[PDB]
UniProtKB/Swiss-Prot annotation, chain A:
Subcellular location: Mitochondrion
Source organism phylogeny: Eukaryota, Metazoa, Chordata, Craniata, Vertebrata
Protein encoded by which gene: Mrpl47
Residues of the full protein shown: 169 to 240 of 252
Transmembrane regions listed in the UniProt entry: none
Basic residues: bias regions: 62-72
Complex formation: Component of the mitochondrial ribosome large subunit (39S) which comprises a 16S rRNA and about 50 distinct proteins.
Organism encoding this protein: Mus musculus
Protein name per its UniProtKB record: Large ribosomal subunit protein uL29m
Family: Belongs to the universal ribosomal protein uL29 family.
Curated annotation (Swiss-Prot), chain B:
Signal peptide: none
Coiled-coil ranges per UniProt: none
Included stretch of the parent chain: 30 to 106 of 423
Protein name, per record: Large ribosomal subunit protein mL37
Family according to the record: Belongs to the mitochondrion-specific ribosomal protein mL37 family.
Summary of subunit composition and partner proteins: Component of the mitochondrial ribosome large subunit (39S) which comprises a 16S rRNA and about 50 distinct proteins.
From Swiss-Prot, chain C:
The name this protein goes by in its record: Large ribosomal subunit protein bL28m
Organism whose genome encodes this protein: Mus musculus (Mouse)
GO molecular function: structural constituent of ribosome
Gene that produces this protein: Mrpl28
Subcellular location: Mitochondrion
Matches recorded under Gene3D superfamilies: Ribosomal protein L28/L24
From Swiss-Prot, chain E:
S-S pairs: none
Quaternary structure and partners: Component of the mitochondrial ribosome large subunit (39S) which comprises a 16S rRNA and about 50 distinct proteins. Interacts with BCL2.
Gene that encodes the chain: Mrpl41
Domain of life: Eukaryota
Protein name: Large ribosomal subunit protein mL41
Length: 72, 70, 242, 95, 96, 172
RNA sequence: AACUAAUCCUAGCCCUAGCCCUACAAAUAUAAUUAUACUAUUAUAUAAAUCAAAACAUUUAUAAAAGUAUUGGAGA
RNA sequence: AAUUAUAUAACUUAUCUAUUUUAAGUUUGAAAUUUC
């Protein structure tokens, strides 16, 4: 199933075989599938980072375009 | 008498009628923002000695009211 | 870069797309609508225009609500709009005196009230103002149902409202068990608040609860492709027969 | 109930804006607080007998907590709603 | 195997994999194929193709005869549960 | 990493890794006895590392339990523990546990409890003795080592005699 | 015509514009990345100060009307 | 030190509680200001 990790990302969680149910398994409950409040800052950075990535590739493309103009 | 044992180590939505509160049972893991489910008895399907517990003495067929001193 | 829509519009965009759009309209309206709580610690201006004494000119007026802090404990009780006013005080109420940090606490109490709809006596944190409102509302059950969420100012009260609305809506026999004649009287007494069962279910539900409920409502076990193809084959064969 | 008013006049925001509060605008004056006052009077009906405040069945005006903490808490007094008030007089009429 | 209390190893026969080796006698397929043999265009099998090849003929015959009902979906090959089969499609209970 | 060491489930007379579990509720009915007066034997007067006074092992019936030793407690002595409130003066052997009602005024006592059932908490140090200043009906006055005179119900248990090391309070 | 050296042009970036976003297996929060039980499972109070007032103390920003009326150790 | 010292703390009165016939004073001082 799709689950949210402690980093705020949504990732597919593959289920594991256990002899006891989840509620009787404290260790499985010990595993954290919830995001902490401080991840809100990270989420904004991810959106900004994605926007930054688009800018960087465009800058990278511009440098490659210089080669086209320079060669021809 | 002196008390032995440091004190440090010493030990709504549900009430609404006609509806059942949502719980993280579907999630299969605890989350603070969902209600704690009430779980019915679990059935392993086989006997595990490591987790098996001996039956009480009184329920034994050989239990006798008279005390036998050995 | 820069976000075309401000951060506050991010919430609106999320509500307009995904499971939030699929949420029931009645519940969506309840969340979207915001109603100002009845003033308690401040008096709104009676008139919208006044003559300034200095210039003798009519000027439009504005209302400044006093800041009031409502602790979560109020969400577990039934407060009649009273709240903790946190701020600074001047000793003896003269500006020439020292400033002291002050927390003003309305006197709070825990008392028991009987609910006819639920036929149970609930021990609740309540203030004297709420008791007057209950009498003005013509009953504790009436007060919970009549009072809006903001004026009620209690999650516990909202939970009672959902239960009362759900109880009234369903004509549930659980009301006053083994007294069918008495059950009808309670429904007739509070008949004004009868509403569709769907709406009553979502009254007072938290956002996390609402999203999970809608997710559960729309969750569907995967359809075995055998069944899907069997119906498709039969439909195609039946269509061919036509 | 506590009522407070800002000491410092806040510049008017006009027709459709919100004034921006400042540090001196954060200081408030206490016009009235029930805590400093003695308990205000409250109207209640004695459902039992209490010493030297009357007898069961009478309507007495007593200070809110003083009446509430002693009479109502023990159960001596009760609140008089409009519905039970009309019922009580009808019951008293039949009495 | 399982390590029980007292630090003693106890091998479990069931958990020990057994290599099922097929008989290659009479089998005409070898590691390599002729360059003389033309290659076949890849046609990955799908549920639609599998259902059409196996399940469709039975229903088509039954539909014309009229001996079709919803209750008998298992008759045409539906499995209500994977329990009872040594190899369960979901959840997978066998190794590669 | 701090775990309480006072976690022994079973009361024992053997030193515990050593700590010997002391009993400050003198009249605890031992096995195979009704809540009636019972007698015990002082097996040995041992040394307690965790207490200034020396502890004397007192055993009766099928139960053996450590207790504080009085001034004249010695090995082989017999110690009586009675719950009955004597109509007349009850025979007093130093170290015996008796209700304040049983004892007469002026008898030195130790290991007294402020409230019935509380257990001995004062006069547990070496050389400390409580004097029964006054006795009336069900109330008695006992002078604690702090010199604070307290009035308690006669149900409270008092052990006759002073604590061992009679000259501990006189140390210079 | 000498050794050490030197020579080069893009690697890429920067500012605005535009634009919100909705981009294998196996193992893992236990001791993370240890294929199955242990042990239940959980962040955060005005932001302050520095700083300015040449120190320091209330105090110190974070379309036009207009830097006007006002406020302020009436001073920054 | 001088001067104040509604941090708090106490008492008195309210307060809040029982019965039943923090604020305002004052005091300590968390401190503040000035001088040494």
């Amino acid at each position: 199933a799709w689950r949210r990790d402690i980093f705020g990302r949504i990732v597919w969680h593959k289920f594991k075989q256990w002899p006891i149910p989840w509620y009787l398994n404290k260790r499985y409950n010990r595993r954290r599938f919830f995001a902490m409040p401080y991840v809100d800052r990270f989420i904004r950075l991810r959106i900004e980072k994605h926007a930054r990535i688009e800018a960087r590739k465009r800058s990278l493309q511009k440098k490659k375009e210089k080669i086209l103009h320079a060669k021809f | 008498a002196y008390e032995w044992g440091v004190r440090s180590t010493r030990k709504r939505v549900y009430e609404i009628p006609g509806l059942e509160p949502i719980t993280y049972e579907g999630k299969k893991h605890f989350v603070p923002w969902l209600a704690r489910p009430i779980f019915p008895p679990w059935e392993r399907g086989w006997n595990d000695p490591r987790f098996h517990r001996a039956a009480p003495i009184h329920e034994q067929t050989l239990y006798k009211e008279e005390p036998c001193y050995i | 870069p820069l976000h075309r829509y401000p951060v506050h519009l991010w919430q609106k965009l999320r509500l307009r797309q995904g499971i939030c759009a699929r949420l029931p309209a009645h519940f969506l309206r309840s969340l979207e609508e915001e109603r100002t709580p009845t003033p308690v610690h401040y008096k709104p201006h009676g008139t919208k225009f006044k003559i300034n004494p200095k210039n003798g000119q009519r000027e439009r007026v504005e209302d400044v609500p006093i800041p009031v802090h409502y602790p979560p404990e109020s969400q577990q009780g039934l407060w009649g709009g009273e709240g903790l006013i946190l701020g600074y005080r001047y000793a003896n109420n003269d500006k020439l005196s020292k400033r002291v940090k002050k927390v003003w606490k309305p006197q709070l109490f825990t008392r028991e009230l009987y609910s006819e709809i639920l036929d149970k006596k609930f021990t609740v944190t309540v203030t004297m103002r709420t008791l007057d409102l209950i009498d003005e509302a013509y009953g504790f059950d009436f007060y919970i149902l009549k009072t809006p969420k903001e004026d009620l100012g209690s999650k516990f009260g909202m939970d009672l409202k959902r239960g009362m609305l759900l109880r009234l809506a369903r004509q549930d026999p659980h009301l006053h068990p083994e007294n069918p004649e008495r059950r009808a009287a309670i429904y007739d007494k509070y008949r004004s608040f009868v509403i569709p069962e769907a709406e009553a279910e979502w009254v007072g539900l938290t956002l996390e609860e609402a999203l999970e409920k809608q997710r559960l409502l729309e969750e569907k076990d995967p359809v075995p492709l055998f069944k899907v193809y069997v119906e498709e084959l039969v439909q195609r064969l039946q269509e061919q027969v036509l | 109930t506590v009522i407070v008013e800002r000491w410092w006049k806040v510049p008017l925001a006009g027709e459709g804006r919100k004034p921006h509060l400042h540090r001196r605008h954060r200081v408030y004056k206490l016009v009235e607080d029930t805590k400093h006052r003695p308990k205000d009077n409250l109207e209640l009906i004695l459902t039992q007998s209490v010493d030297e405040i009357g007898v069961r069945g009478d309507l007495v005006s007593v200070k809110k907590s003083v009446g509430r903490n002693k009479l109502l808490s023990q159960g001596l007094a009760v609140y008089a709603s409009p519905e039970n008030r009309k019922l009580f007089e009808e019951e008293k009429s039949l009495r | 195997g399982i390590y029980t209390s007292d630090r003693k190893f106890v091998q479990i026969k069931e958990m020990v994999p057994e290599f099922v080796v097929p008989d290659l006698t009479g089998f005409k397929l070898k590691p390599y194929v002729n360059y003389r043999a033309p290659a076949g265009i890849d046609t990955p099998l799908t549920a639609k193709a599998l259902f059409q090849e196996t399940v469709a003929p039975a229903i088509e015959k039954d539909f014309k005869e009229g001996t079709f009902d919803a209750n008998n979906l298992e008759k045409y090959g539906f499995e209500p549960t994977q329990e009872g089969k040594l190899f369960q499609l979901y959840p997978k209970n066998f190794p590669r | 990493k701090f775990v309480s060491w006072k976690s022994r489930t079973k009361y024992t007379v053997k030193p515990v890794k050593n700590y010997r579990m002391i009993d400050f509720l003198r009249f605890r009915p031992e096995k195979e006895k009704a809540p009636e007066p019972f007698e015990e034997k002082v097996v040995v007067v041992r040394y307690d590392p965790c207490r200034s006074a020396d502890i004397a092992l007192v055993a009766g019936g099928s139960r053996k339990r450590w207790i504080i030793a009085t001034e004249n407690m010695k090995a082989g002595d017999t110690i009586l523990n009675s719950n009955h409130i004597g109509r007349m003066a009850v025979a007093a052997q130093e170290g015996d546990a008796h209700p304040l009602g049983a004892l007469p005024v002026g008898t030195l006592i130790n290991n007294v409890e402020s409230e019935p059932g509380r257990g001995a908490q004062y006069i547990r140090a070496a050389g400390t003795c409580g004097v029964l200043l006054r006795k009336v009906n069900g109330t008695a006055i006992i002078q604690l080592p702090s010199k604070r005179q307290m009035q308690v119900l006669e149900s409270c248990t008092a052990t006759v005699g002073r604590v061992s090391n009679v000259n501990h309070n006189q140390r210079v």
